[PDB]
C-alpha cells in the first residue's frame with residue numbers, strides 16, 4: 355500500500371491515480387515481497403541543485419517473478435511513475451508496463467502496454483477477446499514508438515493527455531489491462547521446458563531493448579555516477 359509514501363502527496367494527480375489503481379490491482383494477487391538491495395528501496399540525492407527522490411516497491415507471485423512500482427520526483431520540475439510486472443517464464447504471461455512523465459504543468463507522456471513474451475510476439479486469444487470486448491478508447495496526440503520500441507505490443511497506448519478526461523480514461527484503460535492480466539494469471543498453466551526458455555529470452559530481450567533509453571540512465575549518471583546508475587539499471591529497473 356502507499357500510505358507510507360513520502361512522495362505521493364507531491365506527485366502529479368494522474369501519477370497518484372495510477373499508483374492507486376496499480377496497488378488495488380496487485381492486492382488481489384497472492385503477493386509475496388521481492389527483495390531489492392537494502393539501499394535502493396528509497397533513494398535520495400541531488401541532480402544539478404535539485405533534490406532527487408525515488409521510492410521503489412517490489413513484490414512477486416508464483417506467476418510474476420518481479421512486480422516493480424517506482425515513484426520519483428527528479429527535482430521539482432519532473433515527476434515519474436514507472437511500473438513493470440515481470441512474468442515468471444514457466445507461465446508465459448505477457449509483460450505489463452506503464453510509464454508516466456509529468457511536471458507541474460501536466461502530463462507530457464503516458465504509456466501502458468501488455469508486451470507479448472512469446473516468440474510469435476503475440477497475445478493469448480483470451481486477452482485479444484477480452485481486450486476487444488472493450489473497444490478502441492479515444493485518443494488524441496498519439497506518440498512515436500522508437501526503433502528500440504519493437505518489444506512493445508499493439509494494444510499499447512502512448513499519448514499526451516489533454517484534459518482531466520483523457521487522463522481518467524488513460525487510468526481506466528490501465529485498470530482494464532490489469533484486470534484482464536491478473537485474471538489470466540491465476541489460471542495460467544506451467545509451460546514446457548523448451549518454451550519457458552523462449553519466454554525467458556522474451557524477457558531478457560525486453561529488459562535490454564528498453565534499457566535503450568539513456569534518459570533514465572543519463573540522469574542517474576549525473577546524480578550518482580555511472581557505476582551506481584549501471585547497478586540501478588541492472589538491479590532495479592531491468593534485472594537479467
Ligand SMILES: C=CC1=C(C)C(=O)N/C1=C\C1=NC(=C\c2[nH]c(/C=C3\NC(=O)C(C)=C3C=C)c(C)c2CCC(=O)O)/C(CCC(=O)O)=C1C
Nearest residue numbers: 426428434436451453455462463465564567569570573574
Ligand atoms: C518504457 C518507457 C520508458 C522507460 C523504461 C523509461 O525509463 N522511460 C520511458 C519512456 C519515456 N521517458 C520519457 C522522458 C523522460 N524521462 C526522463 C527522466 C526519467 N525517467 C525515469 O524513469 C527516471 C528515473 C528519470 C530520471 C531520473 C526524462 C528526463 C525525460 C524527458 C522528458 C520529455 O522529453 O518528455 C519519455 C518521453 C521522451 C520522448 O517522447 O521523446 C518517454 C517515452
